[PDB]
């Protein structure tokens, strides 16, 4: 009955179903049934938060944690990262971007470490750097991480171009230190 209800009810009314359904499974579910209902409850509960405010970055981070621990299918996690990322801060002042920028870095870490699609992690960084308002401020983390990523691809020419346009657009101390430490290691 609970499981049948979840299908035809799926968004709005399931909020009642899930609280009883999860209590039900809390006995009988114990290995497979508990974790399934709580995660799927949590999944729809984060989607409620995203429908209320897509600017709730802490809800996206907690949502992405759930799906990565699920080992959710890659295309669904990409759709959730790309939904999360589209919520660019309305203020265009760096104090508001400090939480939003890790919503891109986590995506590049997922694409590099979990999906292992390095040609798609380039596109994550290019899309990231094409969105930061560089003539007002920069995240040196982005330019550093994008530079070191191409070094892991053994492409020094790309890595130097990244750090080179970093200094050219926004000469910043964290960039110089990172670029110098790189050339010293090389």
């Amino acid at each position: 009955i609970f499981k049948y209800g979840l299908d035809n009810l799926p968004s709005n009314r399931t909020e009642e179903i899930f609280k009883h359904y999860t209590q039900h499974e809390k006995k009988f579910g114990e290995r497979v049934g508990i974790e399934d209902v709580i995660i799927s409850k949590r999944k729809t509960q984060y989607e409620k938060m995203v429908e209320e405010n897509g600017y709730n970055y802490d809800a996206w981070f907690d949502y992405l944690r759930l799906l990565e621990n699920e080992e959710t299918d890659r295309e669904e996690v990409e759709d959730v990262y790309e939904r999360a990322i589209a919520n660019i801060p309305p203020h265009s002042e760096k104090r508001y971007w400090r939480r939003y920028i890790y919503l891109w870095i986590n995506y590049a870490l997922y694409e590099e470490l979990v999906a292992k699609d390095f040609d798609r992690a380039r596109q994550v960084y290019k899309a990231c750097i094409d969105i930061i308002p560089h003539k007002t401020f920069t995240f040196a983390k982005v330019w550093i991480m994008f530079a070191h990523f191409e070094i892991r691809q053994l492409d020094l020419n790309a890595a130097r171009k990244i750090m080179g346009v970093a200094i050219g657009k926004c000469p910043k101390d964290k960039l110089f230190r990172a670029y110098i430490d790189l050339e010293l290691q090389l």
């Binding site: 400090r98 870490l109 070191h148 691809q153 053994l154 020094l156």
Partner: protein
Amino acid sequence: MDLDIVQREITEHLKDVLHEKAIDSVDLAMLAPKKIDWDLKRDIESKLQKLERRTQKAVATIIRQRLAE
């Protein structure tokens, strides 16, 4: 029966957080002792060091290949 046992876990909160005696100074650390992103950075650090170890292994081949030619 240890009816109190919930209290034993939260003893740190009940002892050192449940009150504050006074405040009468300020310093550069106290104005901002952790950055507003410190916990996002924390959750990345386990994954970030795998990238670091790949980078150190990668840069070792970049040097080795340069001297091979």
